[PDB]
Symmetry: C3
Subunit: 298 residues, 3 copies
């Protein structure tokens, strides 16, 4: 089964491959069907599930909580990760897309998540996105609260610059469990702007999203050189899909990311986890980086 990995120093133990429920609404699944998927997948070793405040027009959490209700023997078998801090226009109040890292708003959003997911606590609450109007102290207080309430085990951020990650960290008595960022051959800025260097330094494991560029890896016609290279290496590693070569290219960064699977097909989720068994060489790594970029390392 997929190895286990303590994400931070005092952090929790997640499953190296996290299952993400962002497109949940799109998979169109009755709580009956879902609970089946939720089983098959956490039987592979994928026990960590990713969620968020705004997901599915604020429907995804709720939809998932219907599954845990008719299959309550599940909760103990997984780790629930969720976020909050964004204001979608899916609500009449928000006439524009913005952020709400306001003390009371978080505690409002967190307790709603517990309610929607029909769970008594969350394992990870992530400040969804970095806000220009964020006040470290306000967020720290919402956190001390949710904590001494047992409603949230750990805390983390998402898409934070090292400077923003540090800002909020100066206000906390506990080490930020993670910093969910995007990492894939098509999106490699975090590899050198210092984000992944700070994360390796603090021994914090970043959950990596959209490893498949959101799916535009197999569709976007500007990535043929990258898909050709991936196919080549795929034969050299004896992999099943270029996707596995990617989930490995990512898997082997020194900061040690936990790739988040976004597919709604349990068989595609089966393949993924296999990438963990593949062993990619350094020259195979740079060979895929090159094919995705067009130039060589400095």
């Amino acid at each position: 089964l997929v190895q286990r990995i303590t994400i931070a120093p005092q952090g929790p133990e997640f499953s190296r491959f996290v299952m993400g429920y962002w497109r949940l609404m799109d998979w169109n699944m009755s709580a009956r069907q879902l609970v089946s998927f939720i089983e098959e997948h956490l039987d592979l070793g994928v026990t960590t599930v990713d969620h968020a405040d705004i997901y599915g027009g604020y429907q995804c959490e709720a939809a998932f909580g219907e599954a845990l209700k008719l299959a309550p023997h599940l909760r103990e078998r997984m780790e629930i990760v969720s976020k909050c801090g964004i204001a979608t226009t899916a609500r009449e109040e928000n006439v524009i897309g913005h952020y709400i890292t306001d003390r009371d708003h978080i505690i409002k959003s967190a307790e709603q998540s517990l309610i929607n997911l029909a769970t008594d606590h969350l394992d990870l609450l992530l400040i969804h996105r970095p806000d220009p109007l964020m006040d470290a102290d306000e967020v720290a207080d919402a956190f001390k609260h949710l904590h001494q309430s047992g409603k949230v085990r750990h805390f983390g951020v998402s898409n934070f610059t090292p400077a923003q990650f540090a800002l909020l960290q100066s206000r906390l008595p506990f080490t930020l469990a993670t910093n969910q960022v995007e990492i894939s051959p098509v999106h490699q800025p975090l590899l050198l702007d210092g984000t992944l260097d700070q994360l390796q330094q603090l021994r914090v494991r970043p959950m990596a999203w959209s490893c498949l560029g959101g799916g535009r890896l197999f569709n976007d016609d500007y990535f043929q050189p990258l898909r050709d290279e991936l196919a080549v290496v795929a034969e050299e590693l004896n992999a099943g899909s270029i996707e596995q070569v990617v989930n490995a290219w990512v898997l082997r960064l020194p900061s040690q990311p936990l790739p988040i699977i976004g597919s709604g097909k349990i068989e595609r989720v089966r393949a993924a986890v296999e990438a963990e068994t593949l062993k990619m060489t350094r020259q195979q790594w740079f060979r895929i980086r090159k094919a995705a970029l067009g130039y060589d390392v400095p």
Copy 2:
């Protein structure tokens, strides 16, 4: 009276809003007039004045000292901020515009400002601009020498990046009081590049400078939103919205009013009363940049 605010840990307490005298020479004033101006704005609550070594061809400090020498009771109600580190071509000695951050010169110019401003001490001494040749140690000697003489109470920097701020700080025995930077809807690079993050984290407050927004026309949509939010908040002018836009950043800036019109000073100062909501802030931000947050 405008709000009070201790700009930093162990730091001084300035007035939420600051008065900038960089354009003093353009106000076409006379000590006689300038004394009624100084009297009015601090009567309005604006008790912090921002000067600089060079401002006005090296004579805005001098001119402000004449007004003070005609009113020997004003230099107590106010806190004087001044700077040094730049060298303009206004001098005949300076061929090229450059910086000068060596010890003897940071002291030589601090005492000069003391002379020009008709006073025996400055409340804040800022290292005007980040210098490629700045030797954090030479600089730390000048700052400790002045702090002894009691001729300079607190020290700070200006337009420094988190790395240059830390380079200096590390050599100083006392907290840097501020980091005067540029902030406005027409200039937000500091909101995310880490310069405001460092400041909020250290609990230091930046005196935002330059809060041509009305002049430049590519900034019409921005002007239309300020006007549409002014209505909502019931603000006298769109400039009040701007000041309040800046005023509401979590790092808590001290806007520097640069107008010589005492009517505009009062209006900007009344930007506080405004209760701008989160959505209006992102609404103003977007009309300026043109795009939403990530």
Copy 3:
């Protein structure tokens, strides 16, 4: 002779001007000659030498090994600096150019340097360039080992970011001795990107490569205004050549850099070291900055 400087808190003591053997093979020098060159430069004071894994298709170290061989009474009069971490196409095992920073590799290529240079130890070992796959624990691990076995005296990094430098340092019990980076009037991103601000802050002196921009300062059409300036500040300073001013421009920096000479002509290696007496004034410094960039501050 050239002044002596201690590059880091508890680091080694080099000579303000180091000798770089990147183009050694281009000098078409023979073991007997090279020994005369080496002989002469350390007689000026340029005692420290800069080498590296890859340099000269992996030949340079070895060539310097022959110069040290037929005259091994020199090694105790110089400080050897070498690097590892890069993997060029110059070799056949490499289908692409990349970086290799595994533990076993660093240990393997350090011991390899000792063999090629014909010495029992290195004074400083640098990990050539920052790697996306670099694992600090693995590097810090290869460094302790090489340190406890007396093969390497000090450790540094090269072309590192203040975050990559800070990352590696967090795993090391000993102060990184330097961050060999490129510094010249034609390459300034480091004077303001915060790289040299860190080094000055930590009191770690950086070794500066390509101060004359690989030499295109005198060739490239693009730098006429700059050459005309180095020429005006030259007479002003009574400098020997524009190169010397370029060296004086670098020493002037507050992080106190160590310019690396890359000239294969001992006469040029003599002249350049003379820039150590010229006293450049800020205004001249900013005038050389301007002629190079095209704008003020």
